Amino acid sequence: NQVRPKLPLLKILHAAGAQGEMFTVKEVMHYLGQYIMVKQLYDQQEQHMVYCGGDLLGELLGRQSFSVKDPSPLYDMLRKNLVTLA
Ligand SMILES: COc1ncc(-c2nc3c(n2C(C)C)[C@H](c2ccc(Cl)cc2)N([C@@H](C)c2cccc(Cl)c2)C3=O)c(OC)n1
Numbered sequence: 719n720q721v722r723p724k725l726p727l728l729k730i731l732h733a734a735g736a737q738g739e740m741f742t743v744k745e746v747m748h749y750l751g752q753y754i755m756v757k758q759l760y761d762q763q764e765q766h767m768v769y770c771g772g773d774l775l776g777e778l779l780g781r782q783s784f785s786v787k788d789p790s791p792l793y794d795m796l797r798k799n800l801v802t803l804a
Contacts, residue, residue: 721746721800726778733757746800750775750792 720740723731728739731746734753741749754760754768759775761767771782779795 719743720803722803724799724801726774727799730774730778740803743796743800746796 719742721743722740723746730753731741731749734749734756736745736749753775754770757773757775759768759770759773761769766785766787767783768786769783770776770779776782778799779791781791784791
């Protein structure tokens with residue numbers, strides 16, 4: 719249940735304070751949330767929206783925006799960008 723993130727995602731996690739390069743999925747989600755907070759990508763007035771266009775996160779998602787009410791695009795990105803070790 720350890721995952722290794724592809725390099726661009728790893729860079730994002732480190733930017734949010736993560737250390738090392740092996741993580742649990744729980745850790746990955748924690749640090750991604752923290753990244754969104756530190757980079758000010760959330761909408762303060764519409765707190766379901768993340769505006770990730772023009773950030774590396776948007777590049778990974780292939781999106782300008784996503785809603786936390788629909789985790790599908792984020793989870794699809796994570797499936798593609800995480801390597802699960804035995
Ligand atoms: C002050 O404004 C404000 N404050 C807080 C939020 C917010 N809300 C949720 C979260 N945060 C922050 C930690 C980013 C986390 C979360 C974690 C990782 C990602 Cl990559 C995206 C969201 N999260 C979990 C519970 C989560 C779990 C599964 C899927 C998703 Cl998309 C999000 C929410 O719901 C917010 O969102 C727009 N806006």
